[PDB]
Ligand binder design. Structure first.
Ligand code: F43
Ligand SMILES: C[C@@H](OP(=O)(O)O)[C@H](NC(=O)CCCCCCS)C(=O)O
Ligand SMILES: O=S(=O)(O)CCS
Ligand SMILES: O=S(=O)(O)CCS
Ligand SMILES: [K+]
Lengths: 443, 252, 548, 547, 111
């Protein structure tokens, strides 16, 4: 117990679970389910057996529109998904009691491969999961269908794509939630390279679950990046609890208060009132014209409250329009209003606003970006805010009625189907609360 | 809690506060029929049905989400109408409305808003059905717009920072406006039916309604309150970025 | 039978090609060459411009011309050029060959049309397509379309820049003007055009060629970006949408990531480069850049024309400059496309295959690979033995090993139609060549050849790949000369035997069939001859903005 | 009198204080001499390209609805057309970048240590001069050890050479004047003493590879091209075995251990090798510009660096490499045309000299806040007093960049701290936003809203002295009207201190070389020469192409 | 100094570069708080520890080192444990043949 701070745990439905919970019970350094989420993300791979079969049958391997004539292989892979599953398990398993898991999805058209944790314990990075699964698949297919020596390279091309010529996965039929280590924007950015659409697809468009999932990952990445070291730790912990894990039902209460006829401004007024009420902020000086300049009592807790209000404002505004495209404007002017309403710094001391400025630019211009769901913490446009801008973006894509061209239905079909099946991934907030109550007194 | 909206001692800052204040309803200085508005917008002809991008929410099989269903969607989202826009280029020469002023006002007064601030243009993207309604009821009707100083333009927005013409109107490379009467839609396509927007306000009349600081108008250096607030925000951001501790924040 | 390299050897040497004796140190050194004289004279004329700073001097280091300095006759042509004119720095055609590839980018238009009709509600008609195509050919060379007070790029520097359209849907092709369209039916033979349209399907693609000057001032990574901006600008003008809204970001994502086809991919940190660099171009894609397939029914000619383009790009430009620099690797490449030596070896192999297995007559087996590769290698090395003059032409062991193994590999592909079978044949040729003369190539020529046999038919993550998907970034191939170009040749040989229209990507095959290109990709060797004789006019020259 | 008045004179026919003018009466595009040449050239070239359409002003926007402005380059009496300041149409701008790209510095001490310690071959000035005479033959593409070698045409590599420089004066005197970049002969005595004190008794080789190489290939080729020939020259000038164990040490030293490159490599999303504009930090670019050793004017030095910076980062880098098309010419011109930034920076300098004195105040929040507010207020009141000046800088981004540049430069003039000036810049941006209720384009302030927090931050991907920041710094990786001005603020911190260099003294010495095509002492005047087509660049293929 | 992070920090980390980042941050805060370093001088502390980061995606002029290179300089996927210089193995094993062979073989085979 390094911090005196206490939090009340409320769920996705707004029901109270437990009171007087230490803040550190939600820390990635103590919470067991957050540890399970990281471990599982690193060891889970989504396999498209249907894709591998179609790629081998047509000879369409190595990226977009690339086809090799005369190298076709007609193999009943999907039909024999059972034997392939058993083969993949036999190759990846160490002991008959480890977490090695190979599950068939959508009538054997897709597979969900989970490496035993021990393989990762002796691995420097996460890319092992993609490599070992690919190898396990090649050997499984080649041995089952007695594939000839001169044809076997096409099996590799159907699974891994244009590797090793391309230092990325190009035209591959196996996917992870994490991108290649070579596409990292900075050091320790690995857990930020999760597309918004992937979070939304996995959580099955559940706002609270998507916010929780994105916040958990973004904040755990802030610890990996070293941004949560020392004096900054308490800022990110309060950020994670109030913004992502609905601490004291703050997010929900703000949505409840402004969901009916409330605007972004009304949410700003609601959070300022609650912040003043809880003694998080106070009046510095009364100025001419009657404007009161405010000063923070608890800088870290003020940012946490403001961050919670940001998620709430996105839910309210994007929810009123049922369009995800609004998020970039919402994040911007939520922060812009809150600064000229109180004279206090915005979420992430303007970084969240700055991110939103670039986000608006790269979601309404010719220079780059795209639709809200295409972004991630590792994108050049949305890396600036230290875990406070991506979770609200997830809430906008959850709300969207279908305005977007690049929807999770188009970008995250495979990943969505595999990860939504896992209980902790689909409903993170629920298991994170249970995990907080599991280590509550142990800290 | 009663909102403060914006800091500042001057009337310019007070006009910004009045614009942001949803309780303050400014006078209808002009009257433009809705049919004429829809034609200026140019996304559909008056009488043409509303184009739908997605089916109505009432017919969508959405799973249970307690938090999601706390937000009452706007009228345009309920029927699943198309997302269209309206863009304004405000003159730096005492225009009643300003880019960041517009954005702050929209985010304070309206629901389901997607607005974009730029130096030479200010876009507002919303559900077509409610957008026409808000364009007509606020943007067109209220004291916010001046036909001579606030030009409606979707493309070729150049003119916000340019000198006025022989008449006193703002520059328009597509001459959308020429009584102040618009001859073309915001895109550039000439209208078969021109639209009269009414009279223009003189410079001397616009000084008391404008939301811009100018030397010839109200210099910003005269408003020491606003300057103290900006300097405060800048310092708070700097200190916060250096160390987010209460000890460092004593240097405010 | 009659040998093919005799017509170039007798025209090169005064002695009988079978004679193992000659006189030396009696040619006057460097003074024997007309180009060396021009070099020593231009170095004297320019000595004024550099200040007192020394420049090119043949007295420094090795006295060149002790040996008979050989000219070079480009294979399949009657052009006999000087050795120094085949260096890429002195050859404008070679530079334009690379410049044309580098400035090429293909963008899928279907996704963008879907954004217009499904999200914006704007209908896409051939009339709007032709207008878009009229607008892009004004914006792509650097022309303003929506903003006031815009500067513009001088059209005399961007005449080579244009944007064409091609489609597998013949209903859409007829509704487009002949000026803007790369007609698959008008450019390709009946069979090939049908195979291409069957592979492409009912999908419309835009081929944008950015000005040569851009890739020259900047890099290859600029091309896809330059194209994307102007594509985005043209959809704003030709469809009169808002000059910056939510749907525009979708056009950017499709043009830059989702529907883009680039010549080359990015590279790892040690050889860090953006897309559209020679290293990122796979052997299959380069084989599809070369257009000899649609102008000749000769399978050997097709393969060897790809070898010419490959050895020049990969060994001269890529490994000789990008990866090394200096004097470069001109002769390492020339050996593959000069004096009809590789032609003679590949034709012998083709005639051996035809009379034993037949073209595509044998399924790939170890015994087939071993038989063909051994026979072609033995013939090749016995030709160097029967002709001391031929051995004198290919003085470097690397050049001999590359040529012998290229023909061996091509022949295996002529019999099997499998790129990996030909690749395995290549490695056996290298092992045999090493034990024949008790020598192979330079100090580290066989790194990939000793790893070869094991990685040719391997299934391991960084060892496996069909030769079409291999390239200059394949681990074993990332460093050494006399391999990459010949591998593209073996890749073409597998498909030439099968009478295939394309090898890996049909969009590349269609894109480079375009007569609007500066370089003629149908006859690369003849074009290198034109560049060597300074008869070739390239693009990207700054004469309109430079004082005369 | 304001400095932009004498420059606004030939631009506008009316009084700069006039809020009114006439429009739609200029005959459109036909008002410009350049546009006429463009249309005419598009008609002449129509045959050679086939029936394929080309440049046509009737397509899209009718240019010339307003008086199309020419541009007077700051500090010069040259008034050029707007289109001539575009990097594609300007040969001087292309050669500026080409000269930087083809530059590479290699430490010679380590290579000489391999010769003496391992091989036993003694290194004497006689062998150095022989090496330097061999490298100037090998570097442009000349054979030295192998028989039957082809060669590069010398008329395409006349711009290529290799010079030597050293901090040890006892070694400098034993080298030919032709091969040596003399620090004493090129720099003033005090600056040369500061440079030699920073360099120390270390010998460096500056190799300039031919322009044609960087044009055909890329920046990543340069260090490799230099390394091969350095390796070759050591084999020949020291009569070594043509391939032995010690040769590999020469390769490792020239390519990794003792190499100094202009720019570093970039991440996957903007993947590029070394020697690309993105990898060049603000400190290094400030050291490329040689205005410091030809002028005692601190403001001139800073603004000349702004000129070089805005043109490289916004026009070449962000305008082409990162975007392409019409580009960002006007976004950059605003920083080095009509003496506007000059007037604002001079006002700020005179304000500083009065209230604090140059390097008179230690960096504090109160100092930063006072200077940054005053300079911004003056700047935005100048746009208010002159509707014509506001008409010149029509784009909000141009105004914000200029106002904040002068604000930041001024804070650096008083503090001598790059990060203090950087903080001043961010306050100027926040103030400018509340002044006119507008700033720049849609996403101009991403780095400005993250600015104040990351200016004095200590976090791993937020912290860095401005000298070590560059186009790859997270917040600065995308947007225009920042990078060039940041290089200016970086120069301003050292200009106030009367420093010889800002970050790397080897760069300062390397670019002082008169053998370079572009004149780095006067970048603005050189851009004027390029705009008027009186600049002759290198890398032209005229000796190998038909007339 | 020899810094060893608690294993738990790596258990919640995707890669190994966390060790370099956390130590650098721990050092900055340690030096700044101990010597009461001014706000305007603190960026030099960062530059003295991490070098030219974040401008360079590698460690350039840094005063903290690991046996493992940056994840961005990987030649292929899963190559992380192979990026250990031969000299590092020999120095660590104090030129003991059997120990250096063992160390290199263990790392190469685990990779
Ligand atoms: C279509 C866009 C959306 C987008 O993504 N970029 C555009 C256009 C793009 C194009 C214009 C191409 C053409 O004319 O064919 C280019 C030149 C980049 C390119 N593609 O090569 C550019 N802008 Ni724009 N763009 C500019 C600017 C601007 C200013 C113009 C304000 C005004 O009142 O005129 C505004 C932003 C703002 O309001 O702050 C702006 C927006 C816009 N800019 C709006 C067009 C608005 C309109 O309808 O006129 N640019 C500037 O702020 C000045 C420099 C100028 C750039 C050209 C140069 O630097 O040489 C150009 C930079
Ligand atoms: C965001 C990113 O684009 P993507 O979203 O990856 O397509 C990136 N663009 C840029 O940073 C463009 C910079 C130049 C144009 C904008 C000037 S404000 C790039 O092309 O690598
Ligand atoms: O002598 S080496 O084999 O090292 C180089 C051959 S060019
Ligand atoms: O209009 S945008 O601000 O997106 C681009 C300005 S060039
Ligand atoms: K180039």
């Amino acid at each position: 117990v390094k911090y005196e701070d206490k939090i009340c745990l409320y769920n996705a439905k707004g029901e109270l679970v437990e009171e007087n919970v230490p803040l550190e019970a939600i820390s990635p350094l103590y919470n067991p389910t957050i540890q399970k989420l990281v471990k599982d993300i690193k060891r889970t791979v989504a396999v498209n057996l249907a894709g591998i079969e179609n790629a081998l049958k047509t000879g369409a391997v190595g990226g977009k529109a690339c086809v090799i004539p005369g190298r076709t292989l007609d193999l009943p892979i999907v039909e024999n998904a059972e034997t392939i599953m058993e083969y993949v398990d036999k190759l990846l398993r160490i002991s008959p009691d480890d977490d090695t898991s190979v599950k068939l999805i959508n009538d054997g058209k897709q597979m969900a491969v989970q490496l035993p944790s021990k393989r990762l314990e002796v691995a420097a990075e996460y890319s092992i999961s993609m490599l070992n699964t690919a190898m396990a698949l090649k050997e499984a297919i080649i041995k089952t269908f007695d594939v000839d020596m001169f044809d076997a390279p096409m099996v590799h091309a159907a699974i891994l794509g244009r590797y090793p010529q391309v230092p990325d996965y190009m035209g591959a039929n196996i996917a992870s939630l994490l991108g290649a280590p070579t596409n990292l924007e900075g050091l320790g950015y690995a857990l930020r390279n999760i597309m918004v659409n992937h979070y939304v697809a996995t959580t099955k468009k559940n706002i609270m679950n998507a916010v929780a999932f994105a916040s958990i990952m973004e904040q755990t990445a802030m610890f990996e990046m070293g941004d949560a070291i020392g004096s900054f730790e308490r800022l990110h912990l309060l950020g994670l609890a109030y913004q992502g894990l609905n601490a004291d039902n703050l997010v929900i209460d703000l949505v409840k208060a402004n969901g009916k006829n409330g605007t972004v401004g009304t949410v700003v007024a609601s959070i300022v009132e609650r912040a003043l009420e809880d003694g998080v902020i106070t009046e510095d000086k009364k100025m001419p014209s009657g404007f009161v300049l405010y000063k923070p009592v608890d800088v870290a807790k003020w940012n946490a409250y403001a961050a919670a209000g940001l998620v709430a404002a996105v839910i309210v505004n994007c929810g009123a329009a049922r369009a995800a495209q609004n998020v970039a404007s919402t994040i911007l002017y939520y922060n812009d209003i809150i600064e000229y309403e109180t004279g206090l710094p915005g979420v992430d001391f303007g970084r969240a606003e700055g991110t939103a400025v670039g986000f608006s630019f790269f979601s309404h211009s010719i220079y780059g970006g795209g639709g809200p769901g295409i972004f991630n913490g590792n994108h050049i446009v949305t890396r600036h805010s230290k875990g406070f801008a991506i979770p609200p973006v997830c809430a906008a894509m959850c709300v969207d009625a279908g305005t977007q061209m690049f929807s999770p239905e188009k970008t995250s079909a495979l990943v969505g189907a595999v990860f939504s099946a896992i209980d902790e991934f689909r409903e993170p907030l629920k298991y994170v609360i249970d995990g907080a109550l599991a280590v509550k007194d142990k800290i | 809690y009663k909102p403060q909206f914006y800091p500042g001692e001057t009337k310019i800052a007070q006009n910004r506060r009045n614009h942001m204040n949803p309780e303050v309803e400014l006078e209808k200085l002009r009257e433009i029929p809705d049919e004429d508005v829809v034609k200026i917008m140019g996304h559909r002809q008056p009488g043409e049905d509303y184009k739908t991008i997605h089916p109505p929410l009432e017919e969508m099989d959405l799973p249970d989400d307690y938090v999601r269903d706390l937000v009452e969607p706007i009228n345009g989202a309920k029927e699943g109408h198309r997302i269209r826009y309206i863009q304004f280029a405000d003159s730096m020469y005492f225009a009643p409305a300003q880019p960041y002023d517009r954005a702050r006002t929209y985010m304070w007064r309206f629901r389901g808003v997607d607005t974009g601030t730029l130096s030479g243009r200010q876009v507002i993207e919303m559900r077509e059905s409610d957008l026409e309604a808000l364009s007509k009821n606020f943007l067109i009707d209220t004291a916010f717009f001046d036909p001579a100083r606030c030009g409606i333009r979707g493309a070729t927005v150049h003119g916000h920072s340019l000198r006025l013409d022989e008449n006193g109107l703002m520059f328009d490379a597509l001459q959308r406006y020429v009584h102040v009467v618009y001859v073309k839609d915001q895109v550039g396509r000439p209208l078969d039916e021109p639209v009269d927007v009414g009279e223009l306000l003189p410079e001397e009349k616009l000084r008391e309604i404008t939301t811009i600081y100018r030397k010839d108008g109200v210099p910003m250096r005269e408003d020491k309150e606003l300057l103290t607030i900006v300097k405060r925000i800048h310092r708070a951001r700097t200190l916060g970025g250096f160390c987010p501790t209460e000890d460092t924040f004593k240097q405010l | 039978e009659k040998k093919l390299f005799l017509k170039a050897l007798k025209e090169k040497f005064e002695e009988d090609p079978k004679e193992k004796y000659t006189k030396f140190y009696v040619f006057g050194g460097w003074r024997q060459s007309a180009r060396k004289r021009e070099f020593v004279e231009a170095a004297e004329k320019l000595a004024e411009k550099r200040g007192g700073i020394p420049f090119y001097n043949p007295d420094i280091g090795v006295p060149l011309g002790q040996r008979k300095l050989m000219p070079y006759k480009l294979s399949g042509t009657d052009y006999i050029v000087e050795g120094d004119d085949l260096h890429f720095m002195n050859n404008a055609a070679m530079q334009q060959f690379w410049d044309d590839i580098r400035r090429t980018v293909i963008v899928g238009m279907d996704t963008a049309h879907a954004v217009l009709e499904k999200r914006l509600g704007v209908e896409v008609t051939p009339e709007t397509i032709n207008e878009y195509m009229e607008t892009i050919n004004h914006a792509l060379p650097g022309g303003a379309v929506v903003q006031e007070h815009m500067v513009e790029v001088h059209p005399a520097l961007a005449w080579d820049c244009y944007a064409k359209i091609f489609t597998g849907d013949d209903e859409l092709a007829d509704e487009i003007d002949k000026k803007f369209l790369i007609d698959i039916n008008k450019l390709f033979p009946e069979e090939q055009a049908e195979q291409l349209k069957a592979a492409i399907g009912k999908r419309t693609y835009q081929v944008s060629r950015v000005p040569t000057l851009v890739g020259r001032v900047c890099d290859g990574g600029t091309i896809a970006r330059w194209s994307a901006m102007q594509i985005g600008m043209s959809f704003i003008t030709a469809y009169k949408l808002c000059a910056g809204e939510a749907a525009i970001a979708d056009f950017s994502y499709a043009a830059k990531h989702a529907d883009v086809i680039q010549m080359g991919t990015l590279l790892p940190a040690r050889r860090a480069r953006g897309p559209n660099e020679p290293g990122g171009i796979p052997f299959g894609i380069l084989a599809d850049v070369v257009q000899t397939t649609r102008v000749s029914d000769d399978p050997v000619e097709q393969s060897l024309e790809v070898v010419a383009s490959g050895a020049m790009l990969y060994d001269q430009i890529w490994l000789g400059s990008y990866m090394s620099g200096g004097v470069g690797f001109t002769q390492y490449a020339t050996a593959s496309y000069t004096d009809d030596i590789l032609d003679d070896f590949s034709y012998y192999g083709y005639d051996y295959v035809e009379k034993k297995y037949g073209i595509c007559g044998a399924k790939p087996t170890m015994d087939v690979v071993e038989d063909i590769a051994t026979e072609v290698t033995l013939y090749a090395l016995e030709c160097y033995d029967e002709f001391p003059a031929l051995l004198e032409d290919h003085f470097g062991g690397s050049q001999r090993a590359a040529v012998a193994a290229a023909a061996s590999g091509i022949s295996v592909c002529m019999a099997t139609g499998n790129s990996n079978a030909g690749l395995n044949g290549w490695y056996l040729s290298q092992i045999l060549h090493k034990e024949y003369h008790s020598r192979l190539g330079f100090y580290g020529y066989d790194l990939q050849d000793q790893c070869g046999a094991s990685n040719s038919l391997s299934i391991r993550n960084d060892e496996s790949s069909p030769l079409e998907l291999r390239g200059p970034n394949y681990p074993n191939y990332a460093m050494n000369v006399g391999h990459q170009g010949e591998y593209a040749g073996i890749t073409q040989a597998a498909h030439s035997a099968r009478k295939d229209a394309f090898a890996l990507n049909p969009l590349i095959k269609v894109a480079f069939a375009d007569p609007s290109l500066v370089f003629d990709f149908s006859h690369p060797r003849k074009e290198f001859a034109r560049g060597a004789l300074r008869e070739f006019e390239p693009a990207g020259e700054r004469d309109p903005i430079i004082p005369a």
